[PDB]
Design a protein around this nucleic acid. Sequence first.
RNA 1: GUCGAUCCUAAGGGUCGGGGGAACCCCGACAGAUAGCGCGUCGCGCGUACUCCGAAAGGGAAUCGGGUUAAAAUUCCU
RNA 2: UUUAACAGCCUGCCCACCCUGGAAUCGGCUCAGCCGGAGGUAGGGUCCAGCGGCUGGAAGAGCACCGCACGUGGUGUCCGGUGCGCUCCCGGCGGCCCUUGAAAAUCCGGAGGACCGAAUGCCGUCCACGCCCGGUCGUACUCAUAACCGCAUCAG
RNA 3: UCUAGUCCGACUUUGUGAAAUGACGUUAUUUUACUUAUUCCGUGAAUCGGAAGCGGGUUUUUGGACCCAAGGCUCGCUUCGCGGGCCGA
Lengths: 117, 55, 251, 230
Amino acid sequence: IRTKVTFHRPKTLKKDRSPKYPRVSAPGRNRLDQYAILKYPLTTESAMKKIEDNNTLVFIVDIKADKKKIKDAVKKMYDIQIKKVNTLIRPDGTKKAYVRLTPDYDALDVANKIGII
Amino acid sequence: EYKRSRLSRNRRTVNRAYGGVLSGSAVRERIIRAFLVEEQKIVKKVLKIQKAKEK
Amino acid sequence: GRVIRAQRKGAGSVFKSHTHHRKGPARFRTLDFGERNGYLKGVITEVIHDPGRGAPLARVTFRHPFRYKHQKELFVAAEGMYTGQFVYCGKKATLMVGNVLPLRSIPEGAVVCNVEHKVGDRGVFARCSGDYAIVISHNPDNGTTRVKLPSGAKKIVPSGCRAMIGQVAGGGRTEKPMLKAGNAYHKYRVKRNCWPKVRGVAMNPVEHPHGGGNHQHIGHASTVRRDAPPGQKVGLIAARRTGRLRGQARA
Amino acid sequence: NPLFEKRPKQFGIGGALPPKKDVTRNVRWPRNVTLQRKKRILKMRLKVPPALNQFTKTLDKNLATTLFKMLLKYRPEDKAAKKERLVKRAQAEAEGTKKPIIVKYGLKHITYLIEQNKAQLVVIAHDVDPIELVVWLPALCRKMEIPYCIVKGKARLGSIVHKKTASALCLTTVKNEDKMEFSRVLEAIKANFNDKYEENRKKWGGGIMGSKSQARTKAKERVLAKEAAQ
RNA sequence: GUCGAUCCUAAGGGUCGGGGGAACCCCGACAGAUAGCGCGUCGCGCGUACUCCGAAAGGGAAUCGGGUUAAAAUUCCU
RNA sequence: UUUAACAGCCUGCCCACCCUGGAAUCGGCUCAGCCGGAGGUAGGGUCCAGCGGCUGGAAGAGCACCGCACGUGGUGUCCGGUGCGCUCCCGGCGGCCCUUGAAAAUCCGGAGGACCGAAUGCCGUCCACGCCCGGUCGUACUCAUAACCGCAUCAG
RNA sequence: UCUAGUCCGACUUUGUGAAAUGACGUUAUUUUACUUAUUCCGUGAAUCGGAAGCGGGUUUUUGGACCCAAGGCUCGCUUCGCGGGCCGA
Ligand SMILES: [K+]
Ligand SMILES: [K+]
Ligand SMILES: [K+]
Ligand SMILES: [K+]
Ligand SMILES: [K+]
Ligand SMILES: [K+]
Ligand SMILES: [K+]
Ligand SMILES: [K+]
Ligand SMILES: [K+]
Ligand SMILES: [K+]
Ligand SMILES: [Mg+2]
Ligand SMILES: [Mg+2]
Ligand SMILES: [Mg+2]
Ligand SMILES: [Mg+2]
Ligand SMILES: [Mg+2]
Ligand SMILES: [Mg+2]
Ligand SMILES: [Mg+2]
Ligand SMILES: [Mg+2]
Ligand SMILES: [Mg+2]
Ligand SMILES: [Mg+2]
Ligand SMILES: [Mg+2]
Ligand SMILES: [Mg+2]
Ligand SMILES: [Mg+2]
Ligand SMILES: [Mg+2]
Ligand SMILES: [Mg+2]
Ligand SMILES: [Mg+2]
Ligand SMILES: [Mg+2]
Ligand SMILES: [Mg+2]
Ligand SMILES: [Mg+2]
Ligand SMILES: [Mg+2]
Ligand SMILES: [Mg+2]
Ligand SMILES: [Mg+2]
Ligand SMILES: [Mg+2]
Ligand SMILES: [Mg+2]
Ligand SMILES: [Mg+2]
């Protein structure tokens, strides 16, 4: 018997796809690796003052990189921990990242290892 | 600003039936109405039993 | 020529009804078993104003016949209705102002409003403020009823059609003079884009049959036939007569 | 236990909410369901010409079971059975026979057998769609003096021949061991379809109104009948 | 994270199905097996045909002083 | 001649509400209204607003002034009055309409009580404290008698 | 000199009957009956039709509340606890 005057489509089984061949032969290579994310540090006078005043490293990064990926790229690249990352898109269309290291790390020491100072 | 995480429970409740929804006077009116109307139904029910047996 | 004003209204656009602040359609409950056989009690919660509608509206709450929930309704308010009043709808509802009954249960000579034309259409006749219908007679053989409409016309409707007892509230509205263009502006601001009206004789020939001439004058009979095509049918359409209605004509 | 009590509910208009009820007859069915139900009604409302009305007079249930039981004894071989004999012959051919007795199916093949007068019994399905495929078969069988019957279910006929459906079946010859009971079945079938063919050519079917219409019509004629005696 | 966009809906816009149309296109939830949701752990219950677009002045989770640049900040520093 | 968000405590406007009590010789009351046996006046309470008060924040800051050196120290930042004043916000009342002046997201509360623990150790917990996390895009500058449009560094 | 629209008739959609009248078993006209074509109205398609029981000759002083069944009978039962069946309706 039916207690509802409105007919509702009954639930039917649905299977998950089990393709006989993969549409793509293999996964694509990672196009946003650590080297792709971190293009080069910024060596302007304004950028340099932030190395010691704020313990901050200024990087030019790929425009498609987010703060989460920048944080992981800096960890893999220079083996340093980050307190916070601030990003902006410059008028020339490139992305700049202000990376502040934790007190456990010294930006000036890391800057010398990079080779900008 | 009424969100539970932002306001203590005592500030968004009144300890009474329909507290925070009906005033005290309104609750009093409903309670009396519910009791009196229910009593009148009993009178109607009994009153028709005395007349039903009339035969 | 160009498309005259009367023709441009049908396309909609700037001539659509202004309904932004309207409270919704005012109508009876949907006909169901309870109203067909017995009666259902409702309570009036508030009497509200509907922009563009002279007659006030009444919000009524009903207990749903078979669902655990309230059933909200919006009725055209009858004269005498008040908040907290109990309203009874159904075949066996008593003959009192505000109740909704089928015409079959309403005796001859009664005053009714919001009368259905088709059983269950929820009311189409006598809905404006101060208007009502009068039950004339019943025809048990045909199962039909005769009622007198506000215009003075007699109509046959099936006896199952529902109607509210009494007349529509808000009567006497049109007796008060407006006195001002601004009052007319506010009246039609909430109805539709129909005011002010420019006289055809004040226009040019391109946009109205009455336009043009070195004097303002129609130049041909303003009475036009029924079959005139759109754009030509202006003035007194299919007029059986004209001039002041004297004697039996104004009956 | 005195703590248990009866709590009756007073139903009716404006009373206690009624419990869950069967509203099946009021269900707003999908389009497909509605169309097939209206299709059934429309067929019986309209007058059915005799050539189509003869398919409603199907073989009786009691005789149908006997006829279908015999057909099961002459089923065509299955796909697995068919392959199993073709390997028994290949080996036989390598190592250096009787005509089968089975039911004939297929409208094209059956019509040929009827025209050649080699058919002894034709079984026709009553629910062939389009009906024009078999609406003429009874006339052909009558003209060829071959007994025929109309049975219910093209799916049932198809199951005999290992097919989803079959429009009609034919028996060119039965095995000699059971030619007596088969002969009796022919007499009953021939007396119900072939012998009644001429009288059924003027029997228009359909014209059946709905139950509400019939009740409303029967009430009107009672008034006329009740006024006849007075 | 705290200023906005982003979210919400307004007049309205764009559409499924259906109905039109040689077609470009027209109508726009109106001819229809909606979307799914809830609770247990896949089952029960519910279920009225749009999970769409439409506001940097409508609605709306949360940042404040003090300091800092040649040029930025309720965003940087404390 | 200064005092932020935020936190706690206090205060309790104009209204609303509660208890006692029972009013004509009617009284209470606003600039205007208006309110009272459907319970006034009066007496005592509850609640609501705050861009109100105090403390924390916070003087360690800011500002002013006087020094010492050419970063560093000291002193002060105090006590009242006034209003048909101006700007903004709020409260309450009244006038006006044949005009009665959006919606939804979201959030809070309520009615109901299926179901559920313990014989006292489990269950429940919108309480306090502690721990972790925080995407994307916009952000410069002009906003105009020179950064917008008018062919321009145009009296528009 | 034409045209959208509009009015009007025929055929088509378009079937089932009856009566009156008329013409040559067919057949026109008129009125009327039927419901499934077609058209329209209503709803979240929620008590329609018929026949029984019951009553005689289910809800109206009130601005409340109202759902997921109490109860009875009856099988299985891994039993005084679960799962089904029929009433309640
Ligand atoms: K034109
Ligand atoms: K206008
Ligand atoms: K005018
Ligand atoms: K003229
Ligand atoms: K906005
Ligand atoms: K608003
Ligand atoms: K700060
Ligand atoms: K704040
Ligand atoms: K900025
Ligand atoms: K200028
Ligand atoms: Mg940013
Ligand atoms: Mg005028
Ligand atoms: Mg002029
Ligand atoms: Mg002209
Ligand atoms: Mg914000
Ligand atoms: Mg809209
Ligand atoms: Mg489009
Ligand atoms: Mg389509
Ligand atoms: Mg719909
Ligand atoms: Mg549906
Ligand atoms: Mg959305
Ligand atoms: Mg949007
Ligand atoms: Mg805004
Ligand atoms: Mg600046
Ligand atoms: Mg007092
Ligand atoms: Mg302090
Ligand atoms: Mg100081
Ligand atoms: Mg201002
Ligand atoms: Mg509770
Ligand atoms: Mg700026
Ligand atoms: Mg400037
Ligand atoms: Mg400016
Ligand atoms: Mg230009
Ligand atoms: Mg009829
Ligand atoms: Mg419909």
